[PDB]
Ligand binder design. Structure first.
Ligand SMILES: O=c1oc2cc(O)ccc2c2oc3cc(O)ccc3c12
Length: 328
């Protein structure tokens, strides 16, 4: 069968936590008062929730209310426990309250308000320094949740709220996040298509925190090369082919051979043979000001087939790419 895999960092953190910490099924939700919050306007509907801007009339402060769509109280408690565990951490969205919505008859998560401009216009105006700055901020968030035994599993521009004016950043939507337990097999149907790690695309279930680092690499590639998204697959199969046209097919086979994985035979007539490309290939006159040897080496160390070979969040923060970023 498939060769087992372990996270190379924070492997045993949940093993030595009290079971209270990771056993989210047994979590007892403490409900606030739903009348404290008045909905102002709808911000968006996802597959799992509707998101509203609201006001807490007990302090006249803006909040974000996420009213969950009906789903397993499995996944509801999971997001809630993860949010409470990570509360107070660097650039983690802050869960302020949990109330029961009288209309949906589902939980409504109440978050700190953060003032976001969309990633689409924002990513077109980001300077070289801005990209490095915000990447460092994301890494703080990723290193923290990983250190707390949690992988996000849905890292993408949509889930990174940026207040460009106050240069503040928040990682949001922890509804797909999970606890890492060594040797545990996970659902491969996570993350969004363009940001799915190769482990997901070859259906390798024993993944870990390193999944988040591939997704982050995809984001970085889209930013410094100014191509959103970078790997633009039409489906989950074409997605792996897109990646293979850059990282090459030989290292792809090295990867699945290492873990004794078999590709879906439908790849037989679409995968072909491809050499690994040098990242300079994607540099042109309109993005070159965002590119540096440091930028490419960092990107290169994130985008690895082998999840065990990618930089950890902590290692990433040690990278020379962030030397120019002013530290606090
Ligand atoms: O769309 C969202 O989905 C979320 C999901 C979460 O789990 C937590 C927070 C948010 C969240 O905060 C915001 C602030 C804004 O100014 C605009 C949109 C959002 C927004």
């Amino acid at each position: 069968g498939p060769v087992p895999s372990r996270a190379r960092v924070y492997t045993d953190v949940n093993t030595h936590r009290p079971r209270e910490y990771w056993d989210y099924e047994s979590h007892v939700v403490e409900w606030g008062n739903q009348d404290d919050y008045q909905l102002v306007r709808k911000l968006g509907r996802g597959k799992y929730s509707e998101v509203f801007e609201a006001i807490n009339i007990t302090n006249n402060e803006k909040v974000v209310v996420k009213i969950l769509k009906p789903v397993k109280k499995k996944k509801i408690k999971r997001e809630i426990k993860i949010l409470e565990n990570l509360r107070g951490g660097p650039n983690i969205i802050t869960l302020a309250d949990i109330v029961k919505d009288p209309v949906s008859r589902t939980p409504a998560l109440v978050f700190e308000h953060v003032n976001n401009t969309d990633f689409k216009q924002l990513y077109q105006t980001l300077t070289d320094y801005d990209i490095r700055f915000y990447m460092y901020e994301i890494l703080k968030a990723l290193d923290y949740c990983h250190s707390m035994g949690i992988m996000h599993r849905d890292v993408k521009p949509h889930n990174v709220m940026i207040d460009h004016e106050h240069r503040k950043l928040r990682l949001i939507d922890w509804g797909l996040a999970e606890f890492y337990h060594p040797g545990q097999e996970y659902n491969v149907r996570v993350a969004s298509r363009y940001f799915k790690g190769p482990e997901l695309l070859v259906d390798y279930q024993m993944y870990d925190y390193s999944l988040d680092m591939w997704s982050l690499g995809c984001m970085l590639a889209s930013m410094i090369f100014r191509k959103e998204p970078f790997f633009h697959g039409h489906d989950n199969y074409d997605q792996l082919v897109r990646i293979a046209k850059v990282l090459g097919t030989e290292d792809l086979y090295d990867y699945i051979d290492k873990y004794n994985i078999e590709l879906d035979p439908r790849f037989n007539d679409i995968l072909g043979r491809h050499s690994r490309k040098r990242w300079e290939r994607f540099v042109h006159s309109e993005n070159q000001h965002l590119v540096s040897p440091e930028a490419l080496d960092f990107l290169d160390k994130l985008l690895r087939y082998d999840h065990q070979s990618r930089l950890t969040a902590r290692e990433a923060m040690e990278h020379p790419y962030f030397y120019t970023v002013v530290k606090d």
